[PDB]
């Protein structure tokens, strides 16, 4: 819905160059200056470019801006690992009478090999079952790139109810971690033979299994 349309994601190798488009209309980009903003993971936004192509102090010449009518572009030559960030274009829209931003663009640098996830599945504890609750805990770590699908099953049949999965988060070693929880009652935990946590990454899946009879 944003008035300014950015690509949701881009990627390239260290040393390479990449472009981030920002398309608008006569009410915003067509009749006004555009600024670009870098937001590093876990920080506030920083002004990258102003007035289409100008750089403030402390911003290197690797970053550059272009304009061509209703479209605007952000060029980044000689990519670095530190340039991993969300990039936003912004301006004033005269129709909306409001400052406006694009959806954003995730720049992920090709700075690491493909890594498969380590999965660990825990069953409900006796203490939790004694409190009339039941939670299976599936823990996913050391995978790259940071994107996984988690599917649960019970005696072969899928289960969508009770599943709470988190987004991937960057570990200290630059790989990613995630976790999925499956909430149940003690009754339906005991009613099935086995449950399974299936973690898919780049089309390849790792499965782990727990059962009520085990200990």
């Amino acid at each position: 819905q944003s008035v300014l349309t950015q690509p949701p994601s881009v990627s390239a190798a260290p040393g390479q160059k990449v472009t981030i488009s920002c398309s608008g209309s006569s009410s915003n980009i067509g009749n006004n200056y555009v600024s670009w903003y870098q937001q590093l993971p876990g920080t506030a936004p920083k002004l990258l470019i102003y007035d289409n192509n100008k750089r403030p102090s402390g911003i290197p010449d690797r970053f550059s801006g272009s304009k061509s009518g209703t479209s605007t572009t952000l060029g980044i030559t000689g990519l670095q690992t530190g340039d991993e960030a969300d990039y936003y274009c912004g301006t004033w829209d005269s129709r909306l009478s409001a400052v406006v931003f694009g959806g954003g663009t995730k720049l992920t640098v090709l700075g690491q090999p493909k890594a498969n996830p380590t999965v660990t599945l825990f069953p409900p504890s006796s203490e939790e079952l004694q409190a009339n609750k039941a939670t299976l805990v599936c823990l996913i770590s050391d995978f790259y790139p940071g994107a996984v699908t988690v599917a649960w099953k019970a005696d072969g049949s899928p289960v969508k109810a009770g599943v709470e999965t988190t987004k991937p988060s960057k570990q200290s070693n630059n790989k990613y971690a995630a976790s999925s929880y499956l909430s149940l009652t003690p009754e339906q935990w005991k009613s099935h033979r086995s449950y399974s946590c299936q973690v898919t990454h780049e089309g390849s899946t790792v499965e782990k299994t727990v059962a009520p009879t085990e200990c």
Binding site: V34, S35, A44, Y50, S125, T165, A177, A178, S179, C215
Partner: protein, 233 residues
């Protein structure tokens, strides 16, 4: 010297109000236009409002018109955002920002030249939720055949059903730091949080060592130390 420090964020229920502050320094605060920009967790930047150098001209998104009131105090070098009638979608990190240039360039109600937001604050978190403050239940994730591989057993603690964030977790009062994987929290349908923390330890060490997770949750004054060990029959 040139910076913006924000405050006033917190946890409040739907319909309630909150007052944010943004103290400026290192420049003539009374000369520049000031913005509020918010960012919902894992979402894009949404511009909220703007105020002129003298407070005589203001704009904001339709979402917050009649609810949010931007204002300032030039004698005190402070920007304000009086947020009333808060909804769930107002939950975000709120940044305050300053125009690149003190002078604006208008040609009517609908036209201003955009010079960019040069200075930004570090942000203050607003969390709007109907959930009440609750301490976590801490359950042991015991080591087992299914947790062990290559002479390395995994064991942990499940920190279930707490509100709000944050929770800090350590092992053996901070003595055990290697192999600690504390996972970010998951937000459930009930509005309560859950997270897990796991340690990888040698299988041989299980019988000659006691492993205790130290779960602390300050909003509910909950401090729990849970002993994790193998289950028996």
């Amino acid at each position: 010297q040139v910076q913006l420090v924000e405050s006033g964020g917190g946890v409040v229920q739907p319909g309630r109000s909150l007052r944010l502050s943004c103290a400026a320094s290192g420049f003539t605060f009374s000369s520049f236009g000031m913005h509020w920009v918010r960012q919902a967790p894992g979402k894009g930047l949404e511009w909220v409002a703007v105020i002129s150098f003298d407070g005589s001209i203001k704009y904001s998104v339709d979402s917050v018109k009649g609810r949010f009131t931007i204002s300032r105090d030039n004698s005190k070098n402070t920007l304000f955002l009086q947020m009333n009638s808060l909804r769930a979608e107002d939950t975000a990190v709120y940044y305050c920002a300053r125009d690149r240039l003190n002078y604006y360039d208008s040609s009517g109600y609908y036209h201003y030249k955009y010079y960019g937001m040069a200075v930004w604050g570090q942000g203050t978190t607003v969390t709007v939720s109907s959930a009440s403050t609750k301490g976590p239940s801490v359950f042991p994730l015991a080591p087992s055949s299914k947790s062990t591989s290559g002479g390395t057993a995994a064991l942990g603690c499940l920190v279930k059903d707490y509100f709000p964030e944050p929770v800090t977790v350590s092992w053996n009062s901070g003595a055990l730091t290697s192999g600690v994987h504390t996972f970010p929290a998951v937000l459930q349908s009930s509005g309560l949080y859950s997270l897990s923390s796991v340690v990888t330890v040698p299988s041989s060490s299980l019988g000659t060592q006691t492993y205790i997770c130290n779960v602390n949750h300050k909003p509910s004054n909950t401090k729990v130390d849970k002993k994790v060990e193998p289950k028996s029959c």
